[model samples]
Structure formats: structure tokens, C-alpha cells
Target: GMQVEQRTLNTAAHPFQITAYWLDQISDFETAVDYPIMIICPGGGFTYHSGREEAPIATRMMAAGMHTVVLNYQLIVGDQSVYPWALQQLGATIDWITTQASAHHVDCQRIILAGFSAGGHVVATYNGVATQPELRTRYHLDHYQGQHAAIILGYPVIDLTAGFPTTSAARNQITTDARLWAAQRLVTPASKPAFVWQTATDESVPPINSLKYVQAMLQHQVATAYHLFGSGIHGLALALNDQAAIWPQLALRWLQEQGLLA
Candidate 1:
């Protein structure tokens, strides 16, 4: 077993500020180990939401020789949501982390972005949809080095305008209002390798969103793997089921195939 270590970076209301929690496990008496970093993000609400679904996966990764990072990205309502504040914060967080990879004993080449719900949206936006070099420089990540290796989306809310019901509460919390959704139409297909899994019976966010993303990835010739299970409630991040529990393992295998794992 490896020793798990945790730390947090609080980036307040600043546009590019990000409060990220980093997790690591010491192994083999800290002699030699594998360093894999996974950035975790949770859904955003009126207040901050830093849900930790990366724990079990962190343990499994540590057992397999990898490090992890859980990001509590900054989110504000009203005007903050008007612009791409959260998106900027997410990119900045990744930028900042990549800069410190060597100092933190992290393998800059093996980094994955993991998110749930709104956090997934943020990851999607930064990974490919939106690119703001100014924000990246603000975090002193101009030369930050790391790979945006892949994405592990757990029942992720991919499509803002479609898939989800217009009258659903989840959609309201996410899009803010119908007008905002229209204004933010260009925020999908965020770049990077992706592995998305969702339940067909998910009412919160229909499985079509994942399907559409997979199609888009294929059209763009991006590497992707998607699965739509018959059943499993939404927001069940890391919560195990006899069958659905296979997602995490599948994710590890995906990482291995991407050459991010040994």
C-alpha cells in the first residue's frame, strides 16, 4: 500500500484563481514510484462545490503507482457566470499544476482531467472548446509542462442546449437560464483524449449527450471511448454497483492504452 498525501491551493474570486487539492501516495519507502496526476472537479452551486470522487480511484492509482489532484475550482453566480470565469479558473489550475509537476514529483507527461456534472462542463470548455492564453499567463503557466492526456467523464453533463430536458432543475442550475445556453453554444468538443460513460436511463442528463460527443470526437479524429449502460442513477460518482463499478477499472485500462500507465 502507498501513503496518501493531500494539499489544497485556494484561488479566491480572482478570474484565474483556483483552489486545487493535490493527492499523492508514497510507495516503496519513497525510493522509486510512478507519478500519475488526475485533476478532479465537482459540480458548482451558489457556494463552492468540491466533491471528492477521486478517492477510490486515487487509491487504485496509488496501488498502481500514480499521483492524483482534486481541483476545487472557483465559481460565482451573476456576473461571474456571465463570462468564462470558471472555465478560466480550470485552465489556470491545470496550467499552474503543470508548472509545479517536477517539484511535486509528478510525471508531467501523464495527466488526466476528471470531472462530474458542472465540473465536467468546465473541463470540457478548457480542454478544447475555449482557449485564452492571457489567463494561462496570469497563473505563470506560460511554460508549464504537462500532458492533457485524457478525460474521465462520470455521467458528465456534456451538451448544454440539448440532451437534458428544458424544464429540468439540473439544466436550470447549469445553464443559468435559456438565454445563457444560447449564448454559450460554442462551448463543447473541448479538446483532448476522452473516455465518457453514462447511463441510458439517466433522466438528469440523457445519454445522447455522450453519444453526440463520441460522434464529434470521431468526426474530428480524436481518440475516444464511450459507454452507455442500461441503468445507474445520475451523480453516482465513485459509488459502486455490482456491475457499474467497472467504470473505474475501465478508465485505468484506457489510461494504460494511452500509454499513461505502466
Candidate 2:
């Protein structure tokens, strides 16, 4: 059985919502007593959230016996939408999850952060900064004592530096602090394991974005899984009709291998 709940995460100036798809009970074959939670961020170039990638994707993970939270994050509108605003909101959400883990029947230690396109950038950024003491204090995430189990990025916008075009919609939303924009450049040895994939023929965001992130993870000796699909365009969420559809199965296997699914 399953249950859905809409809850407010941050009560700051720009609060956001999280739609949760939770399993009310586990089957006999399930290995873990507490289900893993995958927090999803849908892609929209930071201008909007894509409904296409939200509940449908969450439902699939829930069917696979995992709890899912779909983030309706803040969008970049004008001067009001600036760097670290959405980032801080995400951190607060993580804090909430960590605090309510037991009540929600979630395994806080197995929390997985996943996102697509620009939303992928947000997830990557969270992974990089999750353990940073200063950012934790600034975002009121000091209560987030749990570590992320892994990060999954789907054709993500990994680099905002010169290698990628500045004309990108999400790129224009932030100031020119090179460190703040490029997530690939921020990977540390302490970064969580990552599963990243992209389409080789993606004209929109370029496959090199995922490549650069994988390279950084490798250099830092972080466990990484990288895949480049030979076909398909950008934003292939679930990739239902294409060969890229294998990603969900591959990701599920990876999660099991990492013990996140247990």
C-alpha cells in the first residue's frame, strides 16, 4: 500500500513544498526494515519545475519498494531568485527528513538525492555542500546529521564555467562566483558515490557535462557509475520509449549494490 502527503519544508521567505510517495507497508521479500528515501528534483532550467518528471518518476521508485519525495523547489524569477536560495531550501528539507526519519519509517542514512537537468545541478550542489559546516549553519541545516547514501544525475548540468555556454537560462540566474556555479569543480574526496548518465546525441546540455563530473569523482577516488547512451535527446525522464529506458533498472541495481536498497 502507498500514501501521499504534501508538506511545507522551509518556512523562510521563499518556502517550497515536497510531495511524498511513501510505502505504507513493506512486503515479505523486502530486506530493509526502514525504506530508503529518494528525494527528487525535477528539471526546468531553474525557471520552473517540470511536472513531467515528478510523480510519474516517484511512482516507479515507490513500486520498486522505496519512499520518494518530489521537491517543488523555488524558481528563478528575477532579482528575488538568487544563488543559494533554492539550495538553502533543499538543505532545510534534508534537515526535516533527518529529524523525522523514524516517524516516517525512512532510513535516514540511506537518503538518496536525485535530480534531472537543472534540477540535477541542484542535487549535485547539495551533495558537495551537505557536510560543509559553514553552509550548514547558514542554511539552518546543522540538524542534518545524516549523510547522503548516493547521488543520481540524469543528463545534468554539471558545469557552469566557461566550458558550458553562459547563455543557458540557469546560468544567468547566478552571479559570476565560479565556485558557486560549477558543481563539477567542487567534488571532494568526501563526496558521496554518484551515478551519472547522459545521451551522446543530446544537443541540449551536452554529454560532456556528465563526463566532467565523473572525471572529478574519479580523481577524488569517489565511487562513480557513468553511462552515455548512444541515442535519445535531453530530458529523457524514465526514457520509456528509448533504449535509454535501461537507466532505471541500472540505477536500481546500483542502489542494491551499494546497500541503499537494503
Candidate 3:
């Protein structure tokens, strides 16, 4: 079954809405798009930013041997910097996956969480926070023990507390209206195996965000791979530019190297 749900949040002085699109593709035993059930969280524009153009990527990945789900979670400010709204929605999605796995042929063992800037923060935060006793109980996913398989992060903002470059273009793309950028700094132990990439010259999301977090993960013994290229500006999914489109190929290669793909 396919469905789209729109939820509105009305707080004391903040009003905002989030729309989630759920999709389940048919699969056969020999050809299963199950193991890597991906949850895509697009930045700024919600799910549509990528829901339109990037869906093909998901289609392509699923075709290459992975099932995918694209989530349109809440944006701050217009909603109410309300803690756990997006986090809660993500947890709920996991529950939904568990509920439908048997029918959809979902592997349930390799659950991949992925996203862009703001969305990247969501994936990272969800990974880190999922392990908390409080959140696990509140979300009622106590018996869940699926491996945090891996994370695919493109130009992710890992640290929200540090001051970003004022002249950097990476800072401009996410300057919507609130301190949503702080989400980057909230990453914790729940963060999983990360495959991160960014342009060395990216103006929108500086390479440091990728560099620093990868370094931290490394120091903490967290498994991760950081790739810094020479091109591809901001929000350029799969490095759409003609010259840098190689990023996707490299990403796939990394997956194979890690044995996530055959």
C-alpha cells in the first residue's frame, strides 16, 4: 500500500506542517530490493526538493538492489524548534517498516539512513539518539536490534555549534529562517557507519563540516569514509554537474568495498 500523510503542528505561537510519503515496491525472492531500505530526508524544501528530481536516484538504487523510502519531515521555526518532532517521525517510520517488512520483502537487517544538509542532520541525530534508553522506550522500539547498517551523507552539516565561514556559500543554502543549522552539532554515539562526500571548494556547505565530523568519528572508533572532491557546489545531488558526476560511481564503489553491495 502507498500513502501520503500531512500533519500540522499548532503550538502556542508556532504553526507548521510535515508531509510524509510512504512507498513500497514489489519484489521477488530472487530479485529483492530489500536489504538496504533507504530513508531519504531532503533539505530545506522538504521531500519534494528531492522527491521530484532525486526520486530517480532512489529508483536507480533500488533497481541496483535496494528498497527506499523518502520522508518529508518538519522544518524548524514555522513549526516551533520543538524537540523530537522530526526524531519522533523517524522513529515512527522505522516502526512502519517493521510492520510492513514481511509483506514487502524488506530484509530488516540492513536499514540504511541517508540525507542531505538539514536532513543529513536528522539521519545523524536519529542514529545517535536511537540508542538512548528514553527515546527507545518512548518510541516503543525496544526489541529493535537491526544493525545501523550505514549512512550516506552528502555535504552534511555535522557540527552546529561551531561558527561557519561567513563568506562560505555552504552557509547560505540553509539560512532559511531559524537556527536549524544547530541540528548538525547534535550528533551522538547513535550515529552509524557514514559515507560522506563534499567538494573541497564547496561554498554552501564547507568541507570542514565533513572533515571535522569524520575526524571525530575516527577518533571515537566509529567507522566512516570522507570524500572531498574538487567540484560540485551546494545541494547538487549525486554531483549532477557534468564534470563531477563521478561522485555517485565512487559512492557505489565504496559500498561494494564495504560489502554493502555485491
Candidate 4:
């Protein structure tokens, strides 16, 4: 059986959240085998968290024997802007997971991050800041209690300059810092492994977003995976379209290839 909990995390001025789907061990009911965990940041173009991308995606990963948690990171509402704050929230969520690790039998070393759409931007940017020491210090992650082993980005917005956010005015609402605008430029040799994918015909966010990020991964020598389907609508979370439907399966297989999953 699975256990679900919704908890508020005060990692920023505005509280974000982590809704976890924990799978426990049943032997004596007090302990269970540790399982890999996937903490997801669903797409919302920095504005809203899409419901379609939340629970359904988590439910699918559960079938693959992994604990899944959906993160509702602070969005660009009112005075809010995604930035150092989103990164801080992601870190706090990881720390929270570790605190409850034994109760949920979590495999801390195998933690994974999955972000889609604007959420993809969150995870992608986090991958850059979370792994590299310099960026971590600049971002103030010295005390973070946990780290993700891998990242999955689906139709991510890697660069605000490229397109979609369109105007500098629109972009400023997400982050005023130009350095974090292009996630591809942030990748360093210290960046971690990544899996990225998007539809070639996706008009919502440029396909180059995924391509550029993957290229950086290669140049930086980070393990990476890329898949560009011929056609599919953007923001198709848990995509039912046959072509895009294979993404999760391929992703799971990639983790298996990395030996992080069975």
C-alpha cells in the first residue's frame, strides 16, 4: 500500500509544498525496503502549476517502484519571482525527504528530480546550481542535506532569451537576474547527469531549449540522454499520445542503464 502526505515547507517568503507518495515496507510494518524517489516540479511557465502534470505523473512513476513527490514551487504571482527562491525550495524539499527517510524507506543516494515545462526550467537551473560548488555557495546551498542523483526535463524552457517568454518585460516577472535566464550557459563540468526530451514540433517552447541544454551536458562531460519526438503537443504531461507515451518508459530504462533503477 502507499501513503500520501501534503506538507507545507517554509523555504521561501511564500510557502511552497511537497505532496509525497510514500511506499512503505510491510514486513513488521515498522520498516521497509528503501526505494528510489522522484520529486517533480510540474510545468506552469513560471505562473501556475498545472494539475494535469502533477498526480498523474507521480502515479505512473509509482508503478515503476519509486516514491514520487510533486513540488509546488513558488510561482510568479504578485511579488513572487522564481529564482534563488525556487532553488532554495527544492533544497528544502530534499532535506525534508531525508528527515522522513526511514519512515518511508527512501534510497537517499538514488534521489531524482523531474520537472516539466517551466518546472523543467526550475529543475534544469537547479541541476546547475545544486551540483557545482561555486554556484552552490553563491546560491547559498552549503547546508542542504541532500542531493539528487539525476534530473529529467520535459520541454523545458532553457533560455528566456530564445523565445516564448517573448518580451524582456514578460521575462522579468520570472527572474530579474540575467545570469539565470539561460540555463544552458550555467552548465559546468560540475553539473550532474540529465535526461531531456521534447517534441520537434513543439511551438510552445522552442525545441532548442532541450537541444542546447543537452549539448552543454555533453561538452561539460555530464552523463545525458535526449529524445525528440516527431510530433506532440507541448505540456502533454503523462502524454497519452503513443509517440510521447514512450518517454517515461525510455526514461526508466535510462535509469536502469545508469543502474539507478532495476
In TM-score terms, candidate 2 sits at 0.87
Q: Is candidate 1 or candidate 2 better by lDDT?
A: 2
Put down candidate 4 lDDT per residue, 217-259, tens digits, no spaces. Answer: 9998889999998868433666444555678888889999887
**How does candidate 4 score on lDDT?**
0.86
Best by TM-score: 4
Per residue, candidate 3 scores C-alpha lDDT tens digits across 125-231 of 66666755765666444544454567888777555544443433434433432333554333455556788877787665556777776776776676788788775
**Angstrom error at residue 123, model 2:** 0.9
Candidate 3 lDDT (Cα, 0 to 1): 0.60
Off by over 4 Å in 3: 1-33, 45-53, 77-79, 132-147, 163-190, 233-235, 238-244
- Candidate 2 segments whose C-alpha is farther than 4 A from its true place: 27-32, 134-140, 143-145, 162-172, 233-235, 239-244
- TM-scores for all candidates: the values are 0.72, 0.87, 0.71, 0.93
Winner on TM-score between 2 and 4 is: 4
What TM-score does candidate 3 get on C-alpha atoms?
Answer: 0.71
Backbone clash count for every predicted candidate, in the order shown: 4, 0, 9, 1
Please say which candidate is ahead in lDDT: 1 or 3: 3
lDDT of each: 0.59, 0.76, 0.60, 0.86
For model 1, which pairs clash? 9-19, 128-190, 128-191, 129-190
Which residue window of length 10 is worst by lDDT in model 4? 233-242
